[PDB]
Ligand binder design. Sequence first.
Ligand SMILES: Nc1ncnc2c1ccn2[C@@H]1O[C@H](CO)[C@@H](O)[C@H]1O
Ligand SMILES: Nc1ncnc2c1ccn2[C@@H]1O[C@H](CO)[C@@H](O)[C@H]1O
Ligand SMILES: Nc1ncnc2c1ccn2[C@@H]1O[C@H](CO)[C@@H](O)[C@H]1O
Ligand SMILES: Nc1ncnc2c1ccn2[C@@H]1O[C@H](CO)[C@@H](O)[C@H]1O
Ligand SMILES: Nc1ncnc2c1ccn2[C@@H]1O[C@H](CO)[C@@H](O)[C@H]1O
Ligand SMILES: Nc1ncnc2c1ccn2[C@@H]1O[C@H](CO)[C@@H](O)[C@H]1O
Lengths: 231, 231, 231, 231, 231, 231
Amino acid sequence: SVHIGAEKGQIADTVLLPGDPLRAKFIAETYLENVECYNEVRGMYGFTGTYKGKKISVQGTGMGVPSISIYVNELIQSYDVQNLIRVGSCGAIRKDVKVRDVILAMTSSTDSQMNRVAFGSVDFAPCADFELLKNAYDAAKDKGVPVTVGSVFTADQFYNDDSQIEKLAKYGVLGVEMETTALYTLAAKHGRKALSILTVSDHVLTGEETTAEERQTTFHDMIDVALHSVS
Amino acid sequence: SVHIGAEKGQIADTVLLPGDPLRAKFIAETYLENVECYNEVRGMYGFTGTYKGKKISVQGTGMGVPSISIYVNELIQSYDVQNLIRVGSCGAIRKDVKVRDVILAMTSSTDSQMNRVAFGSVDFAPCADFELLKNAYDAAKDKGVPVTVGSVFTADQFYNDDSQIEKLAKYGVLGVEMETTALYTLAAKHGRKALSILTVSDHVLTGEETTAEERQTTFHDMIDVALHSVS
Amino acid sequence: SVHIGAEKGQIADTVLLPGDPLRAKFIAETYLENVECYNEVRGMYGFTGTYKGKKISVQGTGMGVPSISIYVNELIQSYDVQNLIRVGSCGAIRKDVKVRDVILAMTSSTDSQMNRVAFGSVDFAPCADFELLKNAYDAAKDKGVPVTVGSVFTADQFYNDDSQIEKLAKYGVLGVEMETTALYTLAAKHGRKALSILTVSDHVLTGEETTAEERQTTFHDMIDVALHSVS
Amino acid sequence: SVHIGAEKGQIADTVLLPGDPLRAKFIAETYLENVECYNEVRGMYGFTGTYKGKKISVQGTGMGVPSISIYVNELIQSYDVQNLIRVGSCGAIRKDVKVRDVILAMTSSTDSQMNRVAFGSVDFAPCADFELLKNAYDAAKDKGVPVTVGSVFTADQFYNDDSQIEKLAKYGVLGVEMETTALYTLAAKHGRKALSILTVSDHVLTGEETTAEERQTTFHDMIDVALHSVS
Amino acid sequence: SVHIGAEKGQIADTVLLPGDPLRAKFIAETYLENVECYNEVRGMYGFTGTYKGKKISVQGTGMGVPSISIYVNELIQSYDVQNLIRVGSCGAIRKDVKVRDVILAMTSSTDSQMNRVAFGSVDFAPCADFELLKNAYDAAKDKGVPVTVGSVFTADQFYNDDSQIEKLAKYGVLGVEMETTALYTLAAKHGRKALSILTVSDHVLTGEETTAEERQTTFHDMIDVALHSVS
Amino acid sequence: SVHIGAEKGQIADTVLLPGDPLRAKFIAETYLENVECYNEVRGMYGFTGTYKGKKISVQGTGMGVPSISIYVNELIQSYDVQNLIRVGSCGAIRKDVKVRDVILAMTSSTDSQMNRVAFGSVDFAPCADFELLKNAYDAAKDKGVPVTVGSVFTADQFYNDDSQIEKLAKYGVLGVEMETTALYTLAAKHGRKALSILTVSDHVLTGEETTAEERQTTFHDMIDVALHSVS
Ligand SMILES: Nc1ncnc2c1ccn2[C@@H]1O[C@H](CO)[C@@H](O)[C@H]1O
Ligand SMILES: Nc1ncnc2c1ccn2[C@@H]1O[C@H](CO)[C@@H](O)[C@H]1O
Ligand SMILES: Nc1ncnc2c1ccn2[C@@H]1O[C@H](CO)[C@@H](O)[C@H]1O
Ligand SMILES: Nc1ncnc2c1ccn2[C@@H]1O[C@H](CO)[C@@H](O)[C@H]1O
Ligand SMILES: Nc1ncnc2c1ccn2[C@@H]1O[C@H](CO)[C@@H](O)[C@H]1O
Ligand SMILES: Nc1ncnc2c1ccn2[C@@H]1O[C@H](CO)[C@@H](O)[C@H]1O
């Protein structure tokens, strides 16, 4: 497959999907035994290893719907991937979404035209796989990790002048990132299972940033929750 | 409030929302102790009673987004309703959604312009309250009732010539009804909790109808699951 | 037919269509000789009777485009109805539309996506049948009843935050209701004849309500005009 | 005013609006006493004269919504024109619209974005002035001229590849031209009175053309009907 | 062809396209040897003549996308025209576009739905033929004529209330006219070559008009540049 | 700035923008004297060096509109970049676009909603800076390199099922890539200069791939043309 330089079998049934290919290294290195690096195409590194005896691959996706859509397609069609779990951050758009919370996206809103191109007059609401969602929820509660479950907002432009996230915040949307709608939709189309799990990098509407220590912490939590989300 | 002829306090914190005002009778009569009929405006009957000592109201909504939007607004603004649970049927659009399954909608797709009018360029994906969703899920599993959790499709036209539910079925959508997007959105806007729970009246794509006995059964299950969905 | 529990022949060639199923009773009872009640499905009552020897049916439609679309379809396809006349109220959006005026809608604007789904890039302007329109006009003038003839606005949401009826008022639109675009379109598609006749329940833009006595009066006028609108 | 080279008062309260500036000559010359030519800007001739003692101006508009919109604006704002009556032809899109019929447009559908730019999510249905419409109707019947009253279709492209007039024909639309939506909308916005009256140049869907003699005849009828449409 | 009353061969491979049929006279008369007038249909005059021994036709188009689209279609399909060069004016929307500048449009923005009807979800950006563009550029520089090369804005309404040319000015768009998107698109579809060359009639955003003498001058320049744009 | 880990001054006035951060290395290494690596954030490497004494930076952008939009914003706002030149490949959609041709995009079509979000009813046609465009054109012809100048298509989805590039090919569009509309628009908004220069990786519509040797060749040409495009 054009964008992933892996051979058949090198990629696990389950893949974690950080936006950052260097967080794809750090994860694979700091959490998995017997790492391999299957892809180095474009510097978007993929790694396969084991956690508790089991195969888990970790692939970087890049930023924005088009980028992740490329990898999520090839991972599914070309390497028959069964479980896809994005693990990244997001800006929070509500006061009551706290900097230590870990977000599991049930659904995602978007201003990307990726869906409107496919459907036309229908607002297509993507959907996380409820099994993968439940398992992550349980896995978080069992260990006592704080967790918020609601919707998110997949943006096309990081620096939006015509920013309606003020209106979306009023409707309950928890925060904004730039991939989930893609993951959830492509997974659903091909009959696979997806889930986004997201930490809070900052509050967008109060400007307030989170300290690097808090990020390290909840970043670690996310990955733990991730790693138990299967079965 | 214009459409509901109730006095302050007559309506419970929790309201069930069947489309059919005569199923609003049957429910209230066959399941609740000490029924009252607060509303008879338009023949869209509302009833308040108790189940296991606790107050539970039951209000008919009518068919289509505009109708339910009227009642869900007044119920929230005028009578401070905290929990809104739709209980109705839907046509299934997949072979693997079985006639005995009970559907809990995480999210809803729509061709209603209700959201596009409010947002413009954003596909707004509505969202069930995860607490009410979990509780219903648990309540179903505890008693062994079969349950599917995924997305649905809120249509504007019952008899759609330009029917894209063929394309939606391919993306995983479980079935089609005509209210949920409204409920979920209005609930979320005003900071309340909503959930749709739906039985399967028939398969739309195989034409195949379900026998009246199967309907009676899963209708009963739905209402039981409903009644435990709180706390 | 699924939503109407009538047998072949029980429904007249001509049907009046009040939104309110209890106004469907009141009309049939207070104006027709030898009433029957053919439908009690959902409590959306239909009645057939005679006025001046002639058959006239009266069917409740419910609120919003989706609801009336259901009944108007089945009435046409399943019971070959030739003449469909909605008789309901509307909120006025202009100072010069007076509380005693009776409105005959030539056409209707809408924010419902029902048409855009069918057409795409075309603004489809629905159209009253000019014969039924003329006859009602004549019938009003012959008896001296005040009558305004222009366009209306079929809304999807009764409580619209993004309310552009301020802009529509400037373009001449007389008032807002929630059914006509549906009636006019479905009638036209299947080669039948439709017309909306509407009283003014209140002014939306001046808040000002109309007294119950004025409503009783113009309600009665509407129904008289209706009853002469044929031939 | 930029596009009309007339002085205050030279233009009548009532103006006829043929698309063709040379049909603007022929009309003024063959039907009016004491003709003047107020405008020669762009060769889009305007003429003022009398018919039965009364002032009637005749202005060419050009082809398409943008063109007529220019003239209809200046005629209204700059010369306070009260009555605007388009008189042109159209291609018929139904078998039952006959070549001798004379069409009075109640309303117009369009694929022009002129309205969507102003409104956004609302399908704005333009509307003929019912007084001018009635008078023309009466004036036709009094003299026995055959007349069809329904909707039309204002196109942007004369040679449309993506032609949906096949779908519009099924919904009752009588024929296609390229101005009416503009006239009706601008008239309504500024509180003036408009009406389109149209002959049938040909059938578009059967290819069949009309003979030049039939055109001369119904062209003459149109203008007679026009000339009585006032008071 | 319906709108052009010319016989085969009377129209040149190259045609200039002024909006104004009387500027179509003035050009043909003041610049070409051995003029003919092939078309007088609608008073939209076409002329064929020679400049430096070579055939050059000059056809008036009228105002707005629909009008020019009619002529540009027939000129191409019916008379196999190879080179189409619009020569008209525009209102400038930037301070740095000077009244003496001559504008060559690389591309055009539009609120016309002509493209969205053909494409749907795709913003189609029209495109000038780079050969005709270069030649005009060279021809201007060789003689020292000041020239700006960028984008323009094809409007549907001359008098736009919802005028976003304030936002377009910020994105670099040089000025507004009402034809180019049509020319460029139809030329490209049928594999022909087009270019718009435009003088500045006024600044729209500073209200400031240009004196008639400046217009005469740059009008003349435009036509000279035009006449060298071939080969 | 969040995504670029460079200090003030480390980035040149002119930046080349390959999609591939490893082609950003190869370029900087194989063509520039005294390379520095200012950014290693996300592995999207930026390099500053000299070519013929002059500073030229080279920054990787990633795939898709959202990705390049991030870098093009920060490069402009945070490091005052004056000249931005994308250098990447594209799939060709016409037979007459040859595998050795080098494409200079005048404009770009798109199905990205990035523009429709900002404008609404306006198709915004982006625009290359004509100076940078001319210079590249000259630089190609002076050395005899084959060059095609026309429009392109910025897609959101690499694997488009609803692929209208069949219709776009008919309108003259030369090929499809996933960045240009972003570059051209953001450059224009902030008053900077942009240009895309693209090689042909393959023909999409004939499936036919290009041999690796041909890619090496035209890749080299592109970069040479790039390097002369200034002044
Ligand atoms: N405040 C924000 N607004 C938009 N996206 C944000 C944030 C914060 C984090 N992200 C995520 O990081 C990537 C781009 O920074 C994106 O891929 C996204 O997932
Ligand atoms: N096959 C179908 N298509 C659309 N709606 C359907 C079904 C089956 C059930 N429903 C639900 O019933 C109401 C209208 O029948 C609607 O309110 C809806 O909830
Ligand atoms: N002020 C208003 N805004 C919107 N709809 C209104 C009114 C007043 C009356 N109606 C009509 O009544 C039904 C809902 O109240 C609707 O079916 C409608 O026909
Ligand atoms: N068959 C057709 N399709 C579209 N427009 C048509 C016809 C026939 C007549 N018209 C009218 O004539 C002008 C352009 O020919 C237009 O202004 C229009 O009013
Ligand atoms: N200020 C403006 N706004 C819009 N169009 C303008 C101008 C100035 C000139 N034009 C051009 O002239 C015709 C209509 O006046 C149109 O055909 C157009 O090409
Ligand atoms: N056949 C194609 N379809 C779409 N994009 C293509 C191609 C060929 C090359 N590209 C360019 O490469 C990146 C993704 O492969 C994109 O960034 C794009 O610029």
